[model samples]
Target: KRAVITGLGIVSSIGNNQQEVLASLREGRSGITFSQELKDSGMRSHVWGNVKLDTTGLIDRKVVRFMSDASIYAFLSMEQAIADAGLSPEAYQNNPRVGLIAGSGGGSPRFQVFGADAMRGPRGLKAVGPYVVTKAMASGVSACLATPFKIHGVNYSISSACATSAHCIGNAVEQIQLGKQDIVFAGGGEELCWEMACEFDAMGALSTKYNDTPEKASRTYDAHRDGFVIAGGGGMVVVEELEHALARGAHIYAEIVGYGATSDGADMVAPSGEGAVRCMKMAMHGVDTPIDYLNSHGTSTPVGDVKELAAIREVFGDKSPAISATKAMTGHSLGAAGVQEAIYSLLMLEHGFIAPSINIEELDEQAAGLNIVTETTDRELTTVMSNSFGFGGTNATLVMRKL
Candidate 1:
């Protein structure tokens, strides 16, 4: 009755795969950096997770033209995951029960660029391509993958602000549990844009203090931390039912033992400590052993980091699980944050190494005395949980066990 992750694919500012990204984490290398795009847009705060991507290299020019950069990343990751799941074009054509589910934060800013120019162009905007609609819509990216893969069952997208990918994966698991689909591809994508940078800059929520040192910009749970570095990219996981996986003989990464969801019903931006605690505890229902490790939603924000500590204290108290935040090194990818973090958690489970929260110098007073797994430390892990709390207090907790 359990759903397990059979395969994973990653494309982020960190690296392209589990091994590459994990190595960067182990070596304490950060992918965050000041942006050239924002400077060109006349905006400040150059920090971002600029992808070292070659558009022509990832996909054909014809296909790349209609897709946004965010969509491109999603497509490439999906391609890798489908292959990793031991599926081919023939398999997708023959299997109608396979499903596709994904999420995104900023849909696509690429189409907007053409719109801005069309208004002043001589064609009077009639020259604007029809594909612009498909490229800009929220569900366009997910539909793109579903169509190419020929996955006909339960195809849709979810967006809970920062909880987008987490919700996507959570919903996929629910569907499989309900006998809705045999296999589901679930994840999310995010792309950094000039407007996104400006919005966070207006709120002073971006990490601007370390613009000179981009790698040091994001220091989650550290006392001297200022704010998060806005970065973008995502990860995808192929989830299938236990028996289906066994029948297919897929290499199971880990079993999704538990899932928990809750809402704060409070402020829009601030986190609810009580809600986080409740979500974590709810995931523990019917489980026996204590959690061996925790991949926290540590965004390096001063208050958000402390709030998570408070929530952990309320749930596990002195017996709190060892915690780390991969986002501190990768930067917050908004909606795609959860999926990427979850992939890192699974890698930790696979290699028996819990990656440390990057850039952590000194834990805050509220977060003090907590055994934060700082730096890449090799430790035996059995059961691990990853937490994702979004902007509107929408929270989700996922527990995975090595079987």
Candidate 2:
């Protein structure tokens, strides 16, 4: 009934891989930067976060031409997991029990823009490439993985706005723990683009006040927090049956023990943690083990940050777990945010140090009573909980511990 995390891969605003990310996290680096798109659009604050993944000869030109950025991120991350897991190819060459589930917030914004131009703009439909339809759909991320990874089972994607990565990892864990599968690679991918930013800004969801001082823009749990800064890239994790990993002598990151997912079933969007309390409770239902740290879904939104604190306090009372929000550096990646921060949680579990919540110049009065990790600190952490709440009021909580 248990699964283990054997490997992880990431491409984030702060780093393109685990080593760079670990160094950046310890050094308290900020990935938020001035968005040229916002400047071109004549906005006051132009802060945005995006990955600088140098893909020179990273993939074959012919193969990559058919894939979009979202799938590109997924493919890169998945390759890392495979290598990091120390696999020998025969384990999953054509194994039915091994699978891959990679997801994204939605379709690649670039592909959608190009397809729309070809179909409805001055260009004719004949101008559209044969791969345009496949590349524009959200499922394209997983479709890209299944072929290259040779995954023959449980190959698919999930779309739940912000919590898409958690849904993927949580669902993959269930598959292994329930004996439906032996191994799976689960995560999400996202690409920061101008088209997506315009729509998100249209919903008034962007942090636009610190255009000039972009590094200080995404300060979570701070008083001047306006809203989430958009960001991109993605991460993947190799989840396998505990016995399966051990039989292969795999080097593990952590043990996946609990996962809880819930829907608000009432609202399309909310600042409050409507179903978050139940989600956390469900994750650790029968386990008496206490959590040591929480990788919070603190997106720097004024009401959203405080409301999530209220939900945490509701569950833990005065004894809340040490918490920090990594989005302060990486920015809010929507679906990929969960996968990115979950890797941070895994890093803490592996390295024995909590990453700092940088740029919190002044703490919000609401979070004063909580044990917030404002600076990098060491702790003998055993269990950690990573929380993600999406736009649809969908909540997912993943509980993992040192193996």
Candidate of highest lDDT? 2
Per-model CA lDDT versus the true structure = 0.81, 0.86
Clashes of 2: 0
- The number of residue pairs in model 1 that clash at the backbone is 2
Q: What is the C-alpha RMSD of each candidate to the true structure, in Å?
A: 1.6, 1.4
lDDT of 2 by residue, 1-403 (tens): 6899999999889998998899888877898888787678665458888888687678777677767878888789888888988975788768899998778896788888888888875566777768886688889888877887778779999888889999899999989978988899999888778777777778778887888799999999999988889888879999899998898899988987779899888767674565988898888886668999999999999888998999999989877999999899889888787788889899888988898988888999999789889888988889999999989789999999886
Clashing pairs in 2: none
Off by over 4 Å in 2: 41-45, 121-123
Task: Quote each prediction's TM-score.
Answer: 0.96, 0.97
Predicted structure with the largest TM-score when compared to the true one: 2
C-alpha-based local distance difference test score of model 1: 0.81
Q: Model 1 Cα displacement at 134 (Å)?
A: 1.6
